[PDB]
Design a protein around this nucleic acid. Sequence first.
RNA 1: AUCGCGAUUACGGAU
RNA 2: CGCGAUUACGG
RNA 3: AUCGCGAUUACGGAU
RNA 4: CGCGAUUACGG
Lengths: 129, 129, 129, 129, 129, 129
Amino acid sequence: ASNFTQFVLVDNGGTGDVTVAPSNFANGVAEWISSNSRSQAYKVTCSVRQSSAQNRKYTIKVEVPKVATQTVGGVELPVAAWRSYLNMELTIPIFATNSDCELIVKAMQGLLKDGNPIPSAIAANSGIY
Amino acid sequence: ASNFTQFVLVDNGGTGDVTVAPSNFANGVAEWISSNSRSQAYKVTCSVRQSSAQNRKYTIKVEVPKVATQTVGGVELPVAAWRSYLNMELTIPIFATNSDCELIVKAMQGLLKDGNPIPSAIAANSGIY
Amino acid sequence: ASNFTQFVLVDNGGTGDVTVAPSNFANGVAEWISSNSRSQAYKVTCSVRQSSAQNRKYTIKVEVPKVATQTVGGVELPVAAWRSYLNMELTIPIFATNSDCELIVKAMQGLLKDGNPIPSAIAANSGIY
Amino acid sequence: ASNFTQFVLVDNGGTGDVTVAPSNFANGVAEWISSNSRSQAYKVTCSVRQSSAQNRKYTIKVEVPKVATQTVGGVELPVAAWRSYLNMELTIPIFATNSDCELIVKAMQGLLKDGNPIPSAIAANSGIY
Amino acid sequence: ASNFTQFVLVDNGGTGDVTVAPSNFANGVAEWISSNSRSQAYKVTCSVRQSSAQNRKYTIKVEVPKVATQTVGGVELPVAAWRSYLNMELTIPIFATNSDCELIVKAMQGLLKDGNPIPSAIAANSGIY
Amino acid sequence: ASNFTQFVLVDNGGTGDVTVAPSNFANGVAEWISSNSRSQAYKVTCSVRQSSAQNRKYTIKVEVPKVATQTVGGVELPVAAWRSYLNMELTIPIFATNSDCELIVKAMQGLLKDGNPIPSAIAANSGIY
RNA sequence: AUCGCGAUUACGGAU
RNA sequence: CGCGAUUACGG
RNA sequence: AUCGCGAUUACGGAU
RNA sequence: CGCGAUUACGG
């Protein structure tokens, strides 16, 4: 049994989908990378720790690259023109039951559901208004 | 036209749904709160800023409360036994087109889709394994 | 919901009613004004904020024009001689439920109900006696 | 005549109605409180002052209590869990006619009428949007 | 109603028309940008302020970009060769009627109508003579 | 060409049109005024200069009279209560061709076109909401 | 407050 | 910052 | 005098 | 920390 498996990070129908696969799990930090050039790959890392006596804290990170070709001196390399960085920290008290945690996950999914304020602002280079 | 409207943060069928509604938009920080006692309410805040010459940066925050009743000296008040705090920062270069941003949003939605590694770990008080 | 809508501020039973409509939403401060020059308009603004860790506070301001001997659309100076200013601050502890808040609204409606002391004193250029 | 009379502050249809009565006029501040221990009473105060050469200012305050029984030193005392405070100040120019003042009263009544924006927001622990 | 809607900034007869849409209202500054990377977008901002006891001032800004593709560090980025800036400030007395304001709008529209002096000079990289 | 000619500033469809005609050319600053006393006239001035080595800049100023309750030919004080001031500054990089400039003019026409946000806000004594 | 003040444009300068 | 938090504060 | 300043609310703070 | 980032680094 494992949850350290590959999964679909970006879903575009059943083709053009971005899949990220396990790559490293050193020092309590799980890492997933999409295939092909590491330079143009999507990256996801995750870890958990006892931040304090009563809290556990997750640290999730995602990197979305802008695939491009670099040319210098006639030598072209596969690179990322730039990257978007997502850093999130989730703090959960040790009193949270599995039911409480499921609620916390639904809250995160709802926050980003299509059509809702926040994902709509981001997807349009906008802020709130 | 506005995206500063109320929306469903937690979806439980069509009943028991947690709705969060606009409450304040001071100093570039949009805030949403669920109804009833502010003390037991869900909170969501969001803001955007030009973090540097080439980047814009979103700061999203969510608070999930554990509803409980406090009793002291025979006086009972509606409170939150504790809260989960979600803090996320999304950095996006100014070269990102609307298409690039839509991709960034699909990445975030995919990261948290039911069944995927990360949301499954959280929902089970677990880490990666 | 979306409660930022036009409403009747001064009710004269259909004929001579003063309607006030949304006119600004800068900084989360909602504003409504009558169809007049801003020097002679009825103005209403409302905002909410967490005044402290234990309280939330609504700040409601109203501006009412002096109508007797008024010259519609004219320049009337000094400004202070032709306008009345209402300034309300409602502090509500974060423990107040919707029910508690409904009762608070009723208390305000009762305070200003027709025939009661306060409104009768104001309407007659009087004090309490 | 004398406008210093009792009135019903909170109307719950002649059953559980909070009526408030005259209780003090010391120092030019008219006071009304409900039939309770001074520690659990609803309180209303009003005072008028010639705040300037050409202005008159009414200062009105209402206190809505959340009644409770507290056990202090092993003994039960009637007390208030918390209180909600309404502080309003109305500045009216001395040139205001009686009919000009009636206009101000109607505006305040219309402002808080059931179904209108502001009372709706307050009653729902919400902001205007 | 709500006047914060999208509109066509540059009209090229429904084909290559530059339409601009709401994107931010943080800090009381209404913003509109076109569907482009933030680095190549048309931008329009507007804000109203009570610049004095008896004045209201609208501050409006428009940014027209000259789009281009630039090769930085051997990589292609969507950028703007240069930008044209329009900064306008309109000061209107509070005694201005709605019809007085309509008069101001018509003057501004007449000012820039095709064939009139000013737009003719600007369009021809010329001065008035 | 010679574009320093009389033109219609306020179009009321033939009847009640406000025409503005050349009235001064001192210092290369072109001026146009309506047929009124200078205290009640519509005034337009326009000039161009090389603001810097990289830019040219047009400075356009408009003065519009408050017409409601106006006394034609009378002495109306204070001046600030009876006049609105438009102040436009258009900066254009020296690389802008006539085509680029034509587009810049269209952007200005679109900004003020009837029915769009900005002109509707101004005409209704409002802000953005 | 004003500037036929500047800008890389919600910033800076001068009186 | 896989820094802490009473969560738009603090290191 | 003003504050979308605070409160334990006829008191206190700031400009 | 609505601190910045070349993103498990740094303030």
